[PDB]
Tab-separated table of C-alpha atoms and ligand atoms in Angstrom:
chain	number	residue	atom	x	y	z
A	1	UNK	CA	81.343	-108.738	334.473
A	2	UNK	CA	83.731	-110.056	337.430
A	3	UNK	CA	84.014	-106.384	338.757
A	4	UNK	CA	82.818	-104.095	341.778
A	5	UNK	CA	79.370	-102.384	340.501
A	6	UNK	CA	81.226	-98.602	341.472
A	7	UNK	CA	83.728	-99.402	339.026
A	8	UNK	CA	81.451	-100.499	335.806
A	9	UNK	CA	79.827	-97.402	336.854
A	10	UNK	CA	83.294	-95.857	335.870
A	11	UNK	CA	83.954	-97.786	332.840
A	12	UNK	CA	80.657	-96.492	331.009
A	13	UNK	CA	80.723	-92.772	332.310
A	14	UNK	CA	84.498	-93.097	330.586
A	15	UNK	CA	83.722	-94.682	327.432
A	16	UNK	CA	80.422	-93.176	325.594
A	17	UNK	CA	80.816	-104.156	325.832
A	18	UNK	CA	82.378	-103.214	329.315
A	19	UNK	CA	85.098	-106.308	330.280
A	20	UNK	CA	86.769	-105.409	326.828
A	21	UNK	CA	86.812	-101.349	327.981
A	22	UNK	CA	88.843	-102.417	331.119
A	23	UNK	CA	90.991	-104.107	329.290
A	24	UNK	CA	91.598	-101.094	327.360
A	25	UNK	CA	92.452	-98.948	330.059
A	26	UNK	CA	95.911	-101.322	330.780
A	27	UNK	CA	95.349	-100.110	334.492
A	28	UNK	CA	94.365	-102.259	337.204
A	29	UNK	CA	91.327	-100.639	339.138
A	30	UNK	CA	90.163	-101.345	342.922
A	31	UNK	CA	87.790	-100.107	345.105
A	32	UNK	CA	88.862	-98.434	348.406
A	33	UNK	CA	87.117	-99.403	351.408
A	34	UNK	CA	85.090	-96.383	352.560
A	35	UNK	CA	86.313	-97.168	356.074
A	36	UNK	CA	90.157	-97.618	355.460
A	37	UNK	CA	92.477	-95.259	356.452
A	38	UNK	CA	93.734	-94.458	352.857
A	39	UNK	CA	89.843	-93.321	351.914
A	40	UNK	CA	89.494	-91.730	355.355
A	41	UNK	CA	92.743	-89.240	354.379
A	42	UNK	CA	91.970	-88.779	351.051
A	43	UNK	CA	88.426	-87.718	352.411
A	44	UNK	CA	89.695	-85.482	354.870
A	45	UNK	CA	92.274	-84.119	351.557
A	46	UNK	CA	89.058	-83.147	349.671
A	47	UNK	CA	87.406	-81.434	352.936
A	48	UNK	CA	90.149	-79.072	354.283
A	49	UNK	CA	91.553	-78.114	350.716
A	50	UNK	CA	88.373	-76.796	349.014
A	51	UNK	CA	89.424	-73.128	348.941
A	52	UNK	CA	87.226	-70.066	349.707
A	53	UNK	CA	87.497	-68.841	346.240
A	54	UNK	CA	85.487	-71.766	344.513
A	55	UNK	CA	81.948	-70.901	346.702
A	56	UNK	CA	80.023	-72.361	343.394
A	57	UNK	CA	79.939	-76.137	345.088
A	58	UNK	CA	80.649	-78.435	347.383
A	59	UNK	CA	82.304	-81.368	346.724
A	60	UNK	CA	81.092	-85.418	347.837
A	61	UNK	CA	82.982	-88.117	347.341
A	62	UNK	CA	81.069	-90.748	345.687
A	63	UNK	CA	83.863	-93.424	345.036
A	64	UNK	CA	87.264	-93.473	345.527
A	65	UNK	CA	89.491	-96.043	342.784
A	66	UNK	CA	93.196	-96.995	343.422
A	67	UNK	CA	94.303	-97.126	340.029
A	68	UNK	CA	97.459	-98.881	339.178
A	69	UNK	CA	98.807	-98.022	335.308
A	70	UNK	CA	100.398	-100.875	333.211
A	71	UNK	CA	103.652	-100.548	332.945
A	72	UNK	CA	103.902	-97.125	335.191
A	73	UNK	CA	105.221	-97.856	338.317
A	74	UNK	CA	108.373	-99.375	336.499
A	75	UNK	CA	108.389	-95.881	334.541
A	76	UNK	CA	108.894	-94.128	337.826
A	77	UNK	CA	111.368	-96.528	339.292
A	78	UNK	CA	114.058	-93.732	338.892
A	79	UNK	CA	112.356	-90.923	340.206
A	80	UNK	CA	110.516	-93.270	343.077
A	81	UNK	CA	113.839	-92.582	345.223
A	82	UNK	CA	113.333	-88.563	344.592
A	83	UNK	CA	112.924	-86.556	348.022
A	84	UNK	CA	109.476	-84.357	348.306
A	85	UNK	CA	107.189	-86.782	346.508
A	86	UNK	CA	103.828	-85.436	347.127
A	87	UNK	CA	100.543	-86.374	346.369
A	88	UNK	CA	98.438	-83.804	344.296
A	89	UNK	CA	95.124	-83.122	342.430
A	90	UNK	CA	94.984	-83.473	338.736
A	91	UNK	CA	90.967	-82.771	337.046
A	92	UNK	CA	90.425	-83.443	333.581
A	93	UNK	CA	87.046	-83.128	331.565
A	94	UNK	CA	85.521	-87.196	331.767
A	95	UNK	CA	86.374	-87.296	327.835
A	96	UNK	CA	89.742	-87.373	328.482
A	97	UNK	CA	90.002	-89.867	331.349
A	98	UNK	CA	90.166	-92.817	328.358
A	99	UNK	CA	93.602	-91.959	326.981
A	100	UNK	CA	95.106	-90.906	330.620
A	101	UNK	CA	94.182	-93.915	332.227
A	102	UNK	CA	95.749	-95.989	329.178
A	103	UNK	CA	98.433	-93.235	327.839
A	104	UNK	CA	98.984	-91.785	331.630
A	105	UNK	CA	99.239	-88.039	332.086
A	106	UNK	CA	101.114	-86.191	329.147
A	107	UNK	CA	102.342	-83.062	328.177
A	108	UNK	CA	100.454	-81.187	326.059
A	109	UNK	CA	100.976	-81.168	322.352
A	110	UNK	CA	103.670	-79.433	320.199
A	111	UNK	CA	100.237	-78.283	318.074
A	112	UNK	CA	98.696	-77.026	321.148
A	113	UNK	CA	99.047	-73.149	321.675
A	114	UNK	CA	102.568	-72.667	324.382
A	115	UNK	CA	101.125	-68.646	325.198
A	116	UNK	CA	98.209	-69.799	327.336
A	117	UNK	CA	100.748	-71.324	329.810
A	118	UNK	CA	102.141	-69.758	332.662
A	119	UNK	CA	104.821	-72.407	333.104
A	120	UNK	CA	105.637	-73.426	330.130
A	121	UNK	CA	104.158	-77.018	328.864
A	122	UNK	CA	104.101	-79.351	331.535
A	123	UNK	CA	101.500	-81.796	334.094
A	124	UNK	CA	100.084	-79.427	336.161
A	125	UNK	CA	99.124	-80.239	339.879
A	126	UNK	CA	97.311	-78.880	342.585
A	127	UNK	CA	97.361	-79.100	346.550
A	128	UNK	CA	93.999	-77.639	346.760
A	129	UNK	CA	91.054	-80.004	345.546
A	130	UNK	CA	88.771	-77.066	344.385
A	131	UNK	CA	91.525	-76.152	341.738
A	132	UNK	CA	91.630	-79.165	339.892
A	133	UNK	CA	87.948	-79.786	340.528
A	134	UNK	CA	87.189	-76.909	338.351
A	135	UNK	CA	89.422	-78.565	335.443
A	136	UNK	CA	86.695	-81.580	335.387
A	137	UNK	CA	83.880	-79.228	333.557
A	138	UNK	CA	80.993	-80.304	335.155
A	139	UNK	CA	77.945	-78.333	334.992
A	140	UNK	CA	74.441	-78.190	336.637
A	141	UNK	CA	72.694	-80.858	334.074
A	142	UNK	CA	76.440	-83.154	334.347
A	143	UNK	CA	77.296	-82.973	337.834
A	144	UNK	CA	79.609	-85.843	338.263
A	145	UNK	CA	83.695	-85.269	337.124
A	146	UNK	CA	86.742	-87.745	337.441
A	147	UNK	CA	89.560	-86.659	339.405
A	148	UNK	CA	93.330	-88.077	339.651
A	149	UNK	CA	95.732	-88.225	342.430
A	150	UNK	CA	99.131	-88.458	341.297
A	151	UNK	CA	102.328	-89.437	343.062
A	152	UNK	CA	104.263	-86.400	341.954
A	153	UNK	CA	108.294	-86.733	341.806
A	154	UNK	CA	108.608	-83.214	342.567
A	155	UNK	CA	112.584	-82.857	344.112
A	156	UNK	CA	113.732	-79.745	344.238
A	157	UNK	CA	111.342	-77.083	343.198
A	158	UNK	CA	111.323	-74.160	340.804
A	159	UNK	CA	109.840	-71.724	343.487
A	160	UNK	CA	108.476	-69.157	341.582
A	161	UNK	CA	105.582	-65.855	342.108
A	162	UNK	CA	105.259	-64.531	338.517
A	163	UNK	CA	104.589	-65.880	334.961
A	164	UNK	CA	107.877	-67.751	333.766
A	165	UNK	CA	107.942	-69.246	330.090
A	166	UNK	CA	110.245	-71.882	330.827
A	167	UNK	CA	112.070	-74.315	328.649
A	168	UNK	CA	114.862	-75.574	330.650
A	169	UNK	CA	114.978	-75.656	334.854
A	170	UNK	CA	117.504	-74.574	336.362
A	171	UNK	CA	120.674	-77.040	337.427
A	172	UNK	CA	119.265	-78.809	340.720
A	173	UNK	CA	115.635	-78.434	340.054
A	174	UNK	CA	112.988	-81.243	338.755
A	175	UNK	CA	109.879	-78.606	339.409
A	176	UNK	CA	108.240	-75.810	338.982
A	177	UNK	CA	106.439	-74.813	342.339
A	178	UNK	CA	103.610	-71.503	341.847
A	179	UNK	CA	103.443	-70.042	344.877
A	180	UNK	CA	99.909	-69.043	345.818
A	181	UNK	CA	98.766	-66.840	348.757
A	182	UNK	CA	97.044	-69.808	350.599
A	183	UNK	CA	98.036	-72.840	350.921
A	184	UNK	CA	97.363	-76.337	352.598
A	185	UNK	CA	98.263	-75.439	356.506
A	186	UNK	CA	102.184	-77.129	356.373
A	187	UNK	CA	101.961	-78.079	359.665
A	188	UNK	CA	99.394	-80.450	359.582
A	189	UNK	CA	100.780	-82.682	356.973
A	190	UNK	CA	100.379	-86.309	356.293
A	191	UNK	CA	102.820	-88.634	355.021
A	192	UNK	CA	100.837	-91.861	353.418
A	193	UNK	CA	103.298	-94.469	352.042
A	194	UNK	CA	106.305	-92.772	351.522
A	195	UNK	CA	104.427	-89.511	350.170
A	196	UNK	CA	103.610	-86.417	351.096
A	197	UNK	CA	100.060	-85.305	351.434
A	198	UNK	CA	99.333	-81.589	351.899
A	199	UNK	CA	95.524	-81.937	353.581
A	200	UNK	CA	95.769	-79.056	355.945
A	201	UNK	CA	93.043	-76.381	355.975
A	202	UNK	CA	94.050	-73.277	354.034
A	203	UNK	CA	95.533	-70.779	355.400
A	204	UNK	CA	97.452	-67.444	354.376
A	205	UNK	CA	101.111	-68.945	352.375
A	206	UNK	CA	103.035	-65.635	353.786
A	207	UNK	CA	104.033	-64.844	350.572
A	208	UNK	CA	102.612	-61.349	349.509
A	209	UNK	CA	104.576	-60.927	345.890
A	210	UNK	CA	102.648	-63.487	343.875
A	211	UNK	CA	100.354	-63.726	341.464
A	212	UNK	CA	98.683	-66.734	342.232
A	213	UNK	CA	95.567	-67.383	344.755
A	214	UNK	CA	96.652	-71.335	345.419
A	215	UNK	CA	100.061	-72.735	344.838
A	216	UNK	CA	100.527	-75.289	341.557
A	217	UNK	CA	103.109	-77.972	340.420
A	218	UNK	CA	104.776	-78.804	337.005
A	219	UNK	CA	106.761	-81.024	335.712
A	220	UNK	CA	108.037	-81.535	332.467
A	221	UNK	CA	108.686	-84.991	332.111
A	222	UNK	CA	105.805	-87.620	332.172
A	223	UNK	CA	107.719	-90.412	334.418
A	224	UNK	CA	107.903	-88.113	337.316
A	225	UNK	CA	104.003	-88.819	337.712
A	226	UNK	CA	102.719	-92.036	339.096
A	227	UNK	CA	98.899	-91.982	339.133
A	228	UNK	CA	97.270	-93.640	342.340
A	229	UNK	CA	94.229	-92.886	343.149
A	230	UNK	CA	91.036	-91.451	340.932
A	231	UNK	CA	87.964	-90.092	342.618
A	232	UNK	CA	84.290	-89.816	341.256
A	233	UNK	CA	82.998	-86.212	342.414
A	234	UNK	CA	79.710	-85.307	342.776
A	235	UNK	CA	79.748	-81.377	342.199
A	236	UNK	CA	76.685	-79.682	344.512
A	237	UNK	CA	76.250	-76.117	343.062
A	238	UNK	CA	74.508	-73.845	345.494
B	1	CNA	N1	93.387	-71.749	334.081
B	1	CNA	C1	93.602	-70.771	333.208
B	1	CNA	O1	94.388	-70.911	332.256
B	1	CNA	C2	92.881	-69.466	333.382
B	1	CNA	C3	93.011	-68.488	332.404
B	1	CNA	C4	92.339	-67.289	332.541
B	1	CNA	C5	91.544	-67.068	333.647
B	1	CNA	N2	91.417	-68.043	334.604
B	1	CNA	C6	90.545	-67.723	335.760
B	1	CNA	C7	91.226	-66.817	336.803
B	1	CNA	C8	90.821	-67.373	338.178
B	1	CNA	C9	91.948	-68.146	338.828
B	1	CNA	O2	91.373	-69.084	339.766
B	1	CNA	P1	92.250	-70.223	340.458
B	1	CNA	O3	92.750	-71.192	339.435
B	1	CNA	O4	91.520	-70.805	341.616
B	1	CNA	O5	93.414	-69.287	341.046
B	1	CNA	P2	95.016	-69.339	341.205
B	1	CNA	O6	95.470	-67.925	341.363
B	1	CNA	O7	95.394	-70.361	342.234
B	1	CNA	O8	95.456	-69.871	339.760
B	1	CNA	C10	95.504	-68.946	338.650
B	1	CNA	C11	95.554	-69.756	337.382
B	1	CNA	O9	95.840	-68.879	336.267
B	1	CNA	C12	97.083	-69.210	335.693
B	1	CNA	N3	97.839	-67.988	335.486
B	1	CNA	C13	98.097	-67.024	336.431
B	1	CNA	N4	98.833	-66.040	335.980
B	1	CNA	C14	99.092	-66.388	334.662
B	1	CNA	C15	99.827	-65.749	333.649
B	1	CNA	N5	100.460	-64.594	333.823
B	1	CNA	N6	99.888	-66.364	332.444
B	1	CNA	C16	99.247	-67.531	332.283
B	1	CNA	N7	98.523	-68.223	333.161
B	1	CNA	C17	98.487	-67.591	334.345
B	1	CNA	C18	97.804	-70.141	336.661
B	1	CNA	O10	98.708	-70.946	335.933
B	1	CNA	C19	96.627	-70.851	337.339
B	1	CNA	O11	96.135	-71.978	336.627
B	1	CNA	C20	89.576	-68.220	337.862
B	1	CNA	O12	88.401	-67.447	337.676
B	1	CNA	C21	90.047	-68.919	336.583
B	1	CNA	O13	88.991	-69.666	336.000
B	1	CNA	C22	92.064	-69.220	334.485
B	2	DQV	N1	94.648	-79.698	335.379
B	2	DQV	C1	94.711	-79.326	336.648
B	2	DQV	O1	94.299	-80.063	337.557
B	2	DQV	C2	95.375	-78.022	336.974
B	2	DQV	C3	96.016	-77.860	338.198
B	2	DQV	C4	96.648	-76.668	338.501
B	2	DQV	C5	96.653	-75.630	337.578
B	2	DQV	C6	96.053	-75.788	336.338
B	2	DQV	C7	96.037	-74.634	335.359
B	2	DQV	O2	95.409	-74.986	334.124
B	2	DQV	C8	96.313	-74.788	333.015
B	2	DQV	C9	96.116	-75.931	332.061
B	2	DQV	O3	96.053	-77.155	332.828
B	2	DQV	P1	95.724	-78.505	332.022
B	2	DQV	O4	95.999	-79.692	332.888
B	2	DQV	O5	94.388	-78.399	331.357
B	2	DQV	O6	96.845	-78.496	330.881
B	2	DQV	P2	96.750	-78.441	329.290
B	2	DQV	O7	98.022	-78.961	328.714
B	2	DQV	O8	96.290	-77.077	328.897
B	2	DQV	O9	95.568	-79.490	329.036
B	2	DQV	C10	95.808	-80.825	328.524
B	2	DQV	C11	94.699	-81.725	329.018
B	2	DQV	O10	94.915	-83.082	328.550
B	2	DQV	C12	94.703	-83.976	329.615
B	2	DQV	N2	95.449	-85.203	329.347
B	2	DQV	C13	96.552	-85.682	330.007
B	2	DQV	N3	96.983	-86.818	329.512
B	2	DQV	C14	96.104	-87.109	328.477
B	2	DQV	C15	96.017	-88.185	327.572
B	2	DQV	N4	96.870	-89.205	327.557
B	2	DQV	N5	95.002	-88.165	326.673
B	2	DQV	C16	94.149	-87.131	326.696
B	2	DQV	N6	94.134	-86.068	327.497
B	2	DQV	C17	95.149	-86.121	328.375
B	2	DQV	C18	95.135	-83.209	330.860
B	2	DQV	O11	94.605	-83.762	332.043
B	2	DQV	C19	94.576	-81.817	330.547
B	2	DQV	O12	93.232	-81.647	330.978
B	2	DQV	C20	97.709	-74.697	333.633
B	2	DQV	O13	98.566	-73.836	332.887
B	2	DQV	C21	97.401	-74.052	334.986
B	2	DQV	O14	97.329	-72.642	334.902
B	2	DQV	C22	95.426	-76.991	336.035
């Protein structure tokens, strides 16, 4: 193998012959520099944005990947030019991390049960690390989970407080946006590239009619996401 040690790390946690795996994954996978500046944000993202709520860990960062899908960033040429492109959390059990790395992120299933939603079949995001985190499944005996940050062509949001089984936006709108009751500190945003990156410490949103404890993002078509980085988490239950 011609690759970084952290990433054939990767490639067997994933699959369970390595150079053929990586060719599976059609995605072209470097290490970040634990010094740069993009590992040094995304650090400082995982810090600030683990919410009060999730009290069962904390989170270290033991690698941080910038992926780059196949075929991808010509898929998102469209929506690349889309205003309010941000840059959110997406965890997935490890299983799955074969077919989204080679498939990318997709909706979920026609076969797959539509009342469990709250908005409707789409990606789901998150601007609060913990969130997704918690999507990842690990446990005290499997303490290490895969995480994504996607490039999110969000546009104009769907704002909404309350349970809405959607199957249509509305004329204007590309998103859905939950509104939670904390979220990343707006002020102290981050634009990396041409993205938005909501790392701010959480604090209260201001909204008092919602449902929802942290805000999350859907879309509903699978060319609005652009996957960039994925982190290896080590999950430190207290
Ligand atoms: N993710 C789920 O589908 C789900 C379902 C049931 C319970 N829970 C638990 C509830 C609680 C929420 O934590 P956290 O994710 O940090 O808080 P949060 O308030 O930021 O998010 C709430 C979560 O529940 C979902 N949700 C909220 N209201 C509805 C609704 N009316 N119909 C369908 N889905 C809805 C919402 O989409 C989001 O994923 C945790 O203990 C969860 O594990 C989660
Ligand atoms: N997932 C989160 O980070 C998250 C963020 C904010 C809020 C939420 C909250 O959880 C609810 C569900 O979210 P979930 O992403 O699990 O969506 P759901 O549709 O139920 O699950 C499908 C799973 O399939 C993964 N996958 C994606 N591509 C592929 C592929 N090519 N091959 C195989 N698997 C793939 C995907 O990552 C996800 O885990 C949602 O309604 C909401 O309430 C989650």
């Amino acid at each position: 193998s011609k690759l970084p040690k952290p990433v054939q790390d990767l490639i067997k946690m994933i699959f369970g012959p390595i150079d053929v795996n990586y060719e599976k994954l059609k995605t072209d996978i470097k290490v970040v520099d634990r010094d740069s500046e993009e590992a040094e944000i995304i650090r400082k993202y995982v810090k600030n944005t683990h919410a009060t709520t999730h009290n069962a860990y904390d989170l270290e960062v033991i690698d941080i990947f910038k992926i780059e899908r196949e075929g991808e960033c010509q898929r998102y040429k469209p929506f690349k030019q889309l205003h309010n492109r941000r840059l959110l959390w997406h965890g997935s059990r490890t299983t799955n991390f074969a077919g989204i790395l080679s498939q990318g992120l997709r909706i979920a299933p026609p076969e797959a049960p539509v009342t469990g939603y709250m908005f409707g079949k789409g990606i789901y995001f998150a601007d609060m690390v913990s969130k997704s985190a918690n999507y990842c499944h690990t446990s005290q005996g499997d303490p290490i989970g895969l995480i994504l940050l996607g490039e999110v062509a969000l546009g104009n949001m769907y704002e909404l407080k309350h349970a809405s089984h959607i199957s249509k936006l509305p004329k204007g709108k590309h998103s859905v946006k939950g509104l939670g009751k904390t979220t990343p500190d707006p002020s102290a945003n981050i634009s990396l590239d041409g993205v938005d990156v909501p790392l701010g410490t959480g604090i209260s949103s201001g909204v008092n009619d919602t449902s929802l404890l942290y805000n999350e993002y859907i879309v509903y078509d699978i060319a609005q996401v652009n996957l960039k980085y994925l982190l290896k988490l080590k999950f430190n239950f207290k």
